[PDB]
Amino acid sequence: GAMNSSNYAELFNNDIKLFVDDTNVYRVTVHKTFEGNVATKAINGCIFTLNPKTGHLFLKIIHTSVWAGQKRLSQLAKWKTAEEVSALVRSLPKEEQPKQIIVTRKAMLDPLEVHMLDFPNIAIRPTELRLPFSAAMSIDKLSDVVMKATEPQMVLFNIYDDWLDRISSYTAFSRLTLLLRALKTNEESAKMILLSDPTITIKSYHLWPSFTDEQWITIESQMRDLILTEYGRKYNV
């Protein structure tokens, strides 16, 4: 059934699984019209499809042209997501297809179930975890490829860089979710933490800086402090 803290180590076993997050698929800016009404303008979005064991990220860029002339776009966006995930599964060799797909929002369950009817053995699951994958567009290199896209495009990344050479996938996921939670709670401060020291750089082929093990402990502590700081600023504590 649903995925929660009780069955958390299941994410890192050897059954292929993907998280699907649709929160950045349909993105708009709201603005006033010359007549003083309100209108939306869509901007490019993305589906965030992640293997939490390997770090492989299938970033399907959603170009604004897919919304042209369409109605009820927030509903359509869920079905477009499910269509693209189904197309991705079909594109993968049988031995690479997931055995489970975990959606971060319950409203994706029926769209994905319907699109995956041809795959009755792939479990479509919700989760009780509050995952911070909406903050993916706070990762500069991901935001850049989404905003520059002129057509639909899939781009593949490893969201863990080379971390798995040194740490387990449990620890890598925990680091990722801490980074993204921090970027979600205070983007400016999180990015300040990640780059304040110009001698640590981001390799061309990476998303995050090349921190040593000891520097990651310091960074991770600074991100926890930020999240706690913001939690106090928020609730006055």
Binding site: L76, W79, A82, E83, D110, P111, V114, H115, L117, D118
Partner: protein, 300 residues
């Protein structure tokens, strides 16, 4: 006007005939039901006084044979049988009528209730849902499961209703996933009406039969089928106008007849609220919406 004689009534039992019912005491001199209207299917149903468990009964049509009821003390139930000797049967009935040992089917002349509940129900279709080909009548009880319930366990004792499943390849055209899931017109009109049922009359007949099995025997699977067949129509944006108008009449008489005290169990809140207030047909069921709002406003 036809007759279903009883050999005897050896155990205390509440006997239903269609929407009517009466109590018979243990070894009371009861010998059956006369004045049964020709032209409709009928159901004769039973609840034993000493064990309410397993309400059961028999669907039949007196035009198809001479039927009677006899208690079986080994299997512990009232069984319907066919008498092939027409002269034996006429002689039995006449004697019981002369001795006034029969209850009269108590139809008020103004009253079209049973017609309205069975308008599209035919015995030949009942006998395909309830498979026991050596009898002309069909046995149904409280516990019989449907073919769909068994997929999710004895097949000879199942209710072979048409399987309806909104998240199934049958219901969803490849490439039309969103369209077909949000607007079930394809599934209703091409798959079910043109493909399986052939016409709306057979669809309504199965819908009406499913309702009657739910009301009379508390068959959960029958209720599931009745609601699924309503939801499939209400969730279709494109339905022939004559079907919508007929559906409103069908449902009105079903809601009117339902015992008030079994509304809690016979009526699915989600389906009815969806059908009357959110669906494509939320404004097409005027008679049904009015009786539901005045009789069961709690459910809504």
């Amino acid at each position: 006007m036809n007759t279903v004689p009883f050999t005897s009534a050896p155990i205390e039992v509440t006997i239903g005939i269609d929407q009517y019912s009466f109590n018979v005491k243990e070894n009371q001199p009861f010998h059956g039901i006369k004045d049964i209207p020709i032209g409709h299917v009928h159901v004769i149903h039973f609840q034993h006084a000493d064990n309410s468990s397993m309400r059961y009964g028999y669907w039949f049509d007196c035009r198809m044979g001479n039927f009677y009821i006899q208690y079986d003390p080994k299997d512990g139930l009232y069984k319907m049988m066919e008498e092939r000797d027409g002269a034996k049967f006429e002689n039995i009935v006449h004697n019981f009528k002369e001795r006034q040992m029969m209850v009269s089917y108590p139809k008020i002349d103004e009253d079209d209730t049973w017609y309205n509940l069975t308008e599209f129900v035919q015995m030949d279709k009942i006998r395909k849902i309830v498979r026991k080909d050596e009898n002309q009548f069909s046995y149904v009880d409280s516990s019989m499961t449907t073919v769909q319930e068994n997929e999710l366990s004895d097949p000879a004792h199942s209710l072979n209703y048409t399987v309806i499943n909104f998240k199934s390849r049958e219901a969803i055209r490849p490439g039309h996933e969103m369209e077909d899931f949000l607007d079930k017109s394809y599934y209703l009109n091409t798959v079910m009406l043109q493909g399986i049922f052939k016409n709306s009359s057979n669809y309504f007949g199965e819908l009406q039969f499913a309702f009657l099995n739910a009301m009379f025997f508390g068959n959960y699977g029958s209720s599931l089928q009745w609601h699924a067949m309503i939801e499939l129509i209400c969730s279709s944006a494109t339905v022939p106008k004559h079907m919508l108008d007929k559906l409103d009449e069908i449902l009105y008489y079903q809601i009117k007849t339902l015992p008030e005290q079994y509304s809690d169990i016979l009526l699915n809140e989600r389906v009815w609220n969806i059908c009357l207030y959110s669906s494509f047909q939320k404004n097409s069921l005027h008679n049904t919406e009015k009786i539901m709002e005045n009789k069961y406003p709690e459910l809504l």
